Amino acid sequence: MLKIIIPTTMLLPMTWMSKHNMIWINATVHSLLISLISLSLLNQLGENSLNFSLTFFSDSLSAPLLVLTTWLLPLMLMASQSHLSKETTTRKKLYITMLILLQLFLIMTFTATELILFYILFEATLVPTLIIITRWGNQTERLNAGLYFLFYTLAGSLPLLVALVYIQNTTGSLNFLIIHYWSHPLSNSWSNIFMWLACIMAFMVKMPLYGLHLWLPKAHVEAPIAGSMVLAAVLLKLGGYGMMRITTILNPLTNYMAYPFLMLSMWGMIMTSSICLRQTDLKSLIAYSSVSHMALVIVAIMIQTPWSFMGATALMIAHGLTSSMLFCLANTNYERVHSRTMILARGLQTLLPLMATWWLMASLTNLALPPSINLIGELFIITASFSWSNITIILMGMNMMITALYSLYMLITTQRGKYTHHINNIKASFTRENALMALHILPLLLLTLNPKMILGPLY
Amino acid sequence: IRWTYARSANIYPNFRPTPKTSLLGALFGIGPLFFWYYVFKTDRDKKEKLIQEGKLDQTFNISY
Amino acid sequence: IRLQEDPDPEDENLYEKNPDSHGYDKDPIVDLWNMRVVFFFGFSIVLVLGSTFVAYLPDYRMQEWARREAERLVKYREANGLPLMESNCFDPNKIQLPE
Amino acid sequence: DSWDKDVYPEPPRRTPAPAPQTSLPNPVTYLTKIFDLLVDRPVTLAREFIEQQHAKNRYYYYHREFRRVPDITECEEKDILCMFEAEMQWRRDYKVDQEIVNIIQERLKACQQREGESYRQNCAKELEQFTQVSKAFQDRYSDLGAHYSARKCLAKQKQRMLAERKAAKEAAA
Amino acid sequence: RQWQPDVEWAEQFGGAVMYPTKETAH
Amino acid sequence: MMSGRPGRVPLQFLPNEARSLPPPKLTDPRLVYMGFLGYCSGLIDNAIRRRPVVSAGLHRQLLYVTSFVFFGYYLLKRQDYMYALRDHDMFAYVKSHPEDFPEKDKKTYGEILEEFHPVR
Amino acid sequence: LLDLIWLETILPKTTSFIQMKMSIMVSNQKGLIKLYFLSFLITIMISMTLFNYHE
Amino acid sequence: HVTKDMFPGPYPKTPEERAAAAKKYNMRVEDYEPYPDDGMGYGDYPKLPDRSQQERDPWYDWDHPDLRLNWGEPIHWDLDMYIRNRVDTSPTPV
Amino acid sequence: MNVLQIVRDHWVHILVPVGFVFGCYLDRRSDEKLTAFRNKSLLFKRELRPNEEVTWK
Amino acid sequence: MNPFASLTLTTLIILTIPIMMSNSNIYKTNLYPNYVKTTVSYAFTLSLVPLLMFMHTGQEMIISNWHWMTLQTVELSLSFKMDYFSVMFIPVALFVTWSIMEFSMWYMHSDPFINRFFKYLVLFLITMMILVTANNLFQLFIGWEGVGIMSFLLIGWWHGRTDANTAALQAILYNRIGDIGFVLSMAWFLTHSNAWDLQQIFMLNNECPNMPLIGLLLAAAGKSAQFGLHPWLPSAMEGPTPVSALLHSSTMVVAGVFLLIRFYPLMETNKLVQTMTLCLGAITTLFTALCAITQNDIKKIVAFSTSSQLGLMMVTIGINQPHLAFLHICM
Amino acid sequence: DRRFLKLMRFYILLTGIPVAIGITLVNVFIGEAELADIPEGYVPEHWEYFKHPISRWIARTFY
Ligand SMILES: CCCCCCCCCCCCCCCCCC(=O)OC[C@H](COP(=O)(O)OCCN)OC(=O)CCCCCCCCCCCCCCCCC
């Protein structure tokens, strides 16, 4: 993985010494070649995970997420120099450095072999995101955002650390391959119940589960766009990925304690969706939609069914792409209006036809229009849940319904109407954002064409 | 902005845990909780007492 | 107001100076060059060439090997009359049953 | 052809020969002839061109052989080397069995389409075959969970063997 | 223009303790 | 763990015996990373003094990395010796106490009764 | 009612208020030497045999 | 651009607070009916009774004709609820 | 043309390519440390080619 | 292996071509409506022939041209079925379109974006084809929601019309409710029957598809504007008249009953589903016709007549009259 | 708007049409593979057991 790690690390000196004008160009292009190199990592052996070294390995679950992060890295670079144009060169270089360190930590996380190293980099993603959210944020509760986000993450992270070190003392090693091959049945002891809770609740905090999901409507809504997309697209996937890794040594106990959280998500995905309907801000609506989709992924994880795992992975990838695109579109409109209430600027479909389209298939993919990978990922989870329990369907059946409502509602109330007369700053569509939504959208349908890649390790 | 701040910021600072407020919280946030848990658990155990007793269809259910 | 503060700068649109602005930066030449580099690398060698790559990997999950061994053992077992698959994935004789 | 009647049974292709005794001649005839003349013949000759080009240089490839390795039942408790061998062997056996049931499903769907409305009458021969394939696939590989492994399959198999042994012992004195 | 702390934001913790009570007094 | 081991002589980095171990390679990734800390310390030193952090004081940065590598080598040799001592005391105690280290009559999974949990 | 009221009150705000309230009672000591040494005194026999740390 | 006074505050108690919230919401003391203080929020916000955006004048020169909304006029807590697209509060002949 | 300025401007670019080459070099110099089972797994345990004295590099 | 399969596929690829030309900008935007008219008429000419050799012999083949997924038991593949339903629906469908959008090219003559409108009729007809020529329930679902969001966009063609957007959203909500039963049916077939193509499902002889049949009934009720989920068609009437003459006229309102008669081999098993279809169809006929009795307009009146027609349509499917119903969809 | 879409199509087809002609050339000039048993001793290279010439080459280079 050092064919991807070493270039990512060496990307830091390039930006840190590039001229006052070349930082954006150089970072964008070289991150694009980094994504190209990581495109190779989609090469997967039939059943054996690709073990590059002792400390680094990859399989059909880590590789798609890694490719997602590496391909994403140019996208924040393209979305940031709009709101980062009027800044000192050193400050811009550090913003870029925060982004590269974030991507590097995500790569080491996804390619980590020992659970402790996975925890180290997984949590270590907090710091660059914290700096991005706090310093470069524009709204008020950004300072409150950082506190909420850090403390919510850590409150689950530390018990996970205690559980992992206890596992190391008892089992012998935290290596994934060992704990899977040398896996042993888990007894229904209450100490084992608390161990399962410690191993689960950190990822479920970052999932998020309903109830303890307040860090997203107070974090993604406030972060700069680059931070917002890197949060929603991948950082949410950290908990799902960790759960998929950890349920190997968390059975057969899970089912007995699967009952509270599963429905907590199942019911929660309704409320969040309902919360999406009666929203006032675009970014908050997208954040709550992300919460609902991630709750569906939670249900997929706790079913522990092959089909559930494949649908889960597909939903993570598709949701990352769709949420990043929706946040980018919201930023474009907000910057054009310097406000975020989704009533101030409506009826812009005529003014910006390409934005009107980009919003149209962004909503369609968010609404999971078949045969997009969003729809197949959702439907696989629906079928797995129905096999696990029939009634789930109606709740599932409710979700996209309400989702569809808001999935079109903002499009009705932001572009499908009459323009506001007193505003005039809406200029011609700068081709930067249009191109950015292109690099968002075309890979989505490309993966729709061949979903065997994002299908996960169960395929 | 007055509307947005009222429906986004003032809600908690102006919130007082009146008996009615706590009642509504109990009825909505945690009320249907036991309802859904009960119905789902009932289906799960009712079906479970159908597989291990053999009283269910399994002929072509090799995918789950 | 006890705080010497400059007035909030106006929201400066890129089109007023060079109409050909691509919304990247002030200077038209480097703005245009960033256009060329993105529209090259994002689409040409990553989106298009990368799509040829992902559409044309080598054997994935050995599914073709799975089929080309599958019909082989169907030929064998169906020809000799043996059931085309065994209810046990492991031979019961070599498995020592407890008690 | 590219598939044996042993691996993909095909009912014998029999077509009737109608006699258009009516003075009105059927139009679908003329459609077949024109379609053969200005579509089938050019695609065939272009195919001959590219097929002789293919036969000019035909590089070769073979099947990937897989030497058998000791099974998990023979594999010792917590011996990572033989455990890995048996796990990969069992994973590829699971893949081959998945393709077995896929082949049977394709064959029996083909049967249904050949027999048409009489599918119920003329597919039971392969219907029972797919039935037993799926029924034994359920007790061979299903219910193993997302983290299915050779050890879990062996455990399920063992549980089934104790169940059947106990049932046969108690039933038959 | 992102919110940069102003005078009233600065005074929220600039003195004695930032959790003032009657015990803080003066 | 080892501060009370017999034969230890206080206040000396490597107790002579450690030369029987393979010295850490000069290429060693731990060593070069400790050299990287030397480079970084130079960068803060120039930054802390309002200097051209990359080009200012090449000698100062060069001294920083050289000093870190030297103490890096001796620390690595000291680090490896203790871990070697840990293994030495381990296996020697293992052999000296056969009764407290039983051997296991190895048997295969075909005879282990591993219960199976139906995943429903 | 749920998100911005009950969900804030159930976990983040309650813990924040607890820490806020009782960090005040911890850190509002009058600073007098007499009471500090009196507390040291009380801790002496509390650790001595009141908890029976000796035995 | 907008200081504290426009930002909605706590529930008004004295009639002076009622008047203060009245000109905070660019409206007279009579039109200002503070939301019923019950711990649910709002407080200082003025209650616009029920009517949706379909009961306004379709011929008036509304500054926001999409929802027939006038500049700076106070808007309902459920304004998104009671909008032309969503549910209506207009009378029905039956 | 001022080619010295050309190199001073374009020497930002080389860092990631040389890092890629170094990374490839290193993870190539990460398998020779794990030759403990070359042609030793029973599945691939074949004979040693007369002209090719190893199974994999 | 004779031309049947080949030209039956050309009968959809040739009409897929115009959207590719429209997005490639090679098309002449001036006479592009004539371009779609001529493409559709040529499609109709290519479509009579499949009817021709279906009439001479009765040829009914199924093509698994491309294999998409293989989830270790479900070899998902892009497949099509040529049978009496699809084989004879294609020609009448393309003929109806070739008529009504030329009527549009006259009537629709003042909208500046006429090009996108004529594109839109095409996209609707494309999703209609892979809906009606479906071989697995996934293709049927793809068409099911493609026609859904396509009618969504077309109803709100005058997107400045707030009532048009409200009508489009109300139309969308109803078949979102409907497709819950669709998803339930696919889940049941994939779990209990382990099948997602029509062949394997009907072949499996699943004579107890109680919940699947209820789900299909709900999906058809949502798509065909049956009771409880009828009034979205009168709302959809807000769109252009040619939109009403292609989508809402008799094409996507019969998509639900098309799904019904496609699943008729399994429909006969559970008589309660027959009875429930009788209820839904009869009461829809009464209610919509009664509304049209006293209504004062031209468009919504024919809408209520339409919904009455769909009621009495799958009433006959209630008495297991599949081919009679599929003959009546043509009238 | 149109400059954006022109740039997209130009820079897509710029390398789209060379690969588009190339895959057809290697499909109809280079050829396709066929299956047989091992030639009793021939050791297969890692890219041997493959269908498409592009697949064989791409396995030959980075695999
Ligand atoms: C392989 C070695 C790579 C490094 C050494 C070679 C560098 C050049 C690579 C080929 C470039 C081909 C096109 C060259 C166009 C040059 C246009 C130009 O002169 O722009 C200069 C300008 C910056 O200002 P200045 O340099 O002062 O010149 C103007 C003075 N009035 O305006 C500008 O915008 C600067 C130039 C635009 C940026 C070009 C892109 C730089 C990186 C290109 C390669 C990326 C990939 C690298 C790896 C390839 C192999 C995998």
PDB file of N, CA and C and ligand atoms in Angstrom, chain A residues 22 29 33, chain C residues 29 33 37 41, chain I residues 9-10 13 17, ligand 1:
ATOM      1  N   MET A  22       0.282  28.024  -7.632  1.00  0.00           N
ATOM      2  CA  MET A  22       0.328  26.650  -8.114  1.00  0.00           C
ATOM      3  C   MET A  22      -0.187  25.633  -7.099  1.00  0.00           C
ATOM      4  N   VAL A  29      -4.171  18.081  -9.481  1.00  0.00           N
ATOM      5  CA  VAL A  29      -3.705  17.129 -10.485  1.00  0.00           C
ATOM      6  C   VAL A  29      -3.037  15.929  -9.821  1.00  0.00           C
ATOM      7  N   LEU A  33      -3.819  11.872  -9.974  1.00  0.00           N
ATOM      8  CA  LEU A  33      -2.971  10.698 -10.210  1.00  0.00           C
ATOM      9  C   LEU A  33      -2.967   9.741  -9.024  1.00  0.00           C
TER      10      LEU A  33
ATOM     11  N   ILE C  29      -4.976  33.279 -16.914  1.00  0.00           N
ATOM     12  CA  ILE C  29      -4.119  32.261 -17.518  1.00  0.00           C
ATOM     13  C   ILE C  29      -4.032  31.026 -16.622  1.00  0.00           C
ATOM     14  N   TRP C  33      -5.496  27.319 -17.117  1.00  0.00           N
ATOM     15  CA  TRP C  33      -4.628  26.150 -17.034  1.00  0.00           C
ATOM     16  C   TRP C  33      -5.142  25.134 -16.022  1.00  0.00           C
ATOM     17  N   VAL C  37      -6.027  21.193 -16.742  1.00  0.00           N
ATOM     18  CA  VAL C  37      -5.525  20.053 -15.981  1.00  0.00           C
ATOM     19  C   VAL C  37      -6.680  19.245 -15.393  1.00  0.00           C
ATOM     20  N   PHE C  41      -7.323  15.374 -16.432  1.00  0.00           N
ATOM     21  CA  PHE C  41      -7.053  14.262 -15.531  1.00  0.00           C
ATOM     22  C   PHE C  41      -8.319  13.648 -14.944  1.00  0.00           C
TER      23      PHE C  41
ATOM     24  N   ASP I   9       9.928  26.111 -11.545  1.00  0.00           N
ATOM     25  CA  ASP I   9       8.472  26.080 -11.482  1.00  0.00           C
ATOM     26  C   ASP I   9       7.959  24.648 -11.533  1.00  0.00           C
ATOM     27  N   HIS I  10       8.596  23.779 -12.316  1.00  0.00           N
ATOM     28  CA  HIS I  10       8.083  22.436 -12.549  1.00  0.00           C
ATOM     29  C   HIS I  10       8.749  21.375 -11.680  1.00  0.00           C
ATOM     30  N   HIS I  13       6.414  19.150  -9.486  1.00  0.00           N
ATOM     31  CA  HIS I  13       5.679  18.040 -10.076  1.00  0.00           C
ATOM     32  C   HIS I  13       6.333  16.694  -9.801  1.00  0.00           C
ATOM     33  N   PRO I  17       5.607  11.523  -8.499  1.00  0.00           N
ATOM     34  CA  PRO I  17       6.157  10.395  -9.273  1.00  0.00           C
ATOM     35  C   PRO I  17       7.336   9.695  -8.610  1.00  0.00           C
TER      36      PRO I  17
HETATM   37  C1  LIG L   1       7.354  14.684 -16.056  1.00  0.00           C
HETATM   38  C2  LIG L   1       7.994  15.936 -15.505  1.00  0.00           C
HETATM   39  C3  LIG L   1       7.001  16.959 -15.016  1.00  0.00           C
HETATM   40  C4  LIG L   1       7.631  18.218 -14.473  1.00  0.00           C
HETATM   41  C5  LIG L   1       8.483  18.961 -15.470  1.00  0.00           C
HETATM   42  C6  LIG L   1       7.738  19.417 -16.699  1.00  0.00           C
HETATM   43  C7  LIG L   1       6.636  20.423 -16.449  1.00  0.00           C
HETATM   44  C8  LIG L   1       5.731  20.608 -17.641  1.00  0.00           C
HETATM   45  C9  LIG L   1       4.975  19.361 -18.037  1.00  0.00           C
HETATM   46  C10 LIG L   1       4.304  19.447 -19.385  1.00  0.00           C
HETATM   47  C11 LIG L   1       3.412  20.650 -19.553  1.00  0.00           C
HETATM   48  C12 LIG L   1       2.836  20.812 -20.938  1.00  0.00           C
HETATM   49  C13 LIG L   1       2.129  22.126 -21.145  1.00  0.00           C
HETATM   50  C14 LIG L   1       2.989  23.321 -20.825  1.00  0.00           C
HETATM   51  C15 LIG L   1       2.265  24.641 -20.847  1.00  0.00           C
HETATM   52  C16 LIG L   1       3.094  25.798 -20.324  1.00  0.00           C
HETATM   53  C17 LIG L   1       2.312  27.064 -20.177  1.00  0.00           C
HETATM   54  C18 LIG L   1       3.079  28.122 -19.441  1.00  0.00           C
HETATM   55  O1  LIG L   1       4.161  28.536 -19.765  1.00  0.00           O
HETATM   56  O2  LIG L   1       2.474  28.475 -18.312  1.00  0.00           O
HETATM   57  C19 LIG L   1       3.282  29.239 -17.391  1.00  0.00           C
HETATM   58  C20 LIG L   1       2.405  29.866 -16.326  1.00  0.00           C
HETATM   59  C21 LIG L   1       3.104  30.139 -15.010  1.00  0.00           C
HETATM   60  O3  LIG L   1       3.887  31.372 -15.017  1.00  0.00           O
HETATM   61  P1  LIG L   1       5.342  31.409 -15.701  1.00  0.00           P
HETATM   62  O4  LIG L   1       5.945  30.037 -15.577  1.00  0.00           O
HETATM   63  O5  LIG L   1       6.077  32.603 -15.153  1.00  0.00           O
HETATM   64  O6  LIG L   1       5.030  31.675 -17.255  1.00  0.00           O
HETATM   65  C22 LIG L   1       4.239  32.830 -17.656  1.00  0.00           C
HETATM   66  C23 LIG L   1       5.054  34.096 -17.604  1.00  0.00           C
HETATM   67  N1  LIG L   1       4.279  35.261 -18.035  1.00  0.00           N
HETATM   68  O7  LIG L   1       1.053  29.323 -16.175  1.00  0.00           O
HETATM   69  C24 LIG L   1       0.796  28.099 -15.659  1.00  0.00           C
HETATM   70  O8  LIG L   1      -0.358  27.826 -15.457  1.00  0.00           O
HETATM   71  C25 LIG L   1       1.883  27.082 -15.382  1.00  0.00           C
HETATM   72  C26 LIG L   1       1.840  25.891 -16.300  1.00  0.00           C
HETATM   73  C27 LIG L   1       0.552  25.092 -16.176  1.00  0.00           C
HETATM   74  C28 LIG L   1       0.642  23.845 -15.329  1.00  0.00           C
HETATM   75  C29 LIG L   1       1.031  22.615 -16.106  1.00  0.00           C
HETATM   76  C30 LIG L   1       0.881  21.310 -15.360  1.00  0.00           C
HETATM   77  C31 LIG L   1       2.026  20.963 -14.441  1.00  0.00           C
HETATM   78  C32 LIG L   1       2.160  19.478 -14.195  1.00  0.00           C
HETATM   79  C33 LIG L   1       2.045  18.664 -15.469  1.00  0.00           C
HETATM   80  C34 LIG L   1       2.312  17.184 -15.328  1.00  0.00           C
HETATM   81  C35 LIG L   1       1.421  16.470 -14.345  1.00  0.00           C
HETATM   82  C36 LIG L   1       1.729  14.999 -14.212  1.00  0.00           C
HETATM   83  C37 LIG L   1       3.138  14.706 -13.759  1.00  0.00           C
HETATM   84  C38 LIG L   1       3.520  13.248 -13.823  1.00  0.00           C
HETATM   85  C39 LIG L   1       3.498  12.667 -15.215  1.00  0.00           C
HETATM   86  C40 LIG L   1       3.913  11.220 -15.297  1.00  0.00           C
HETATM   87  C41 LIG L   1       3.032  10.289 -14.499  1.00  0.00           C
END
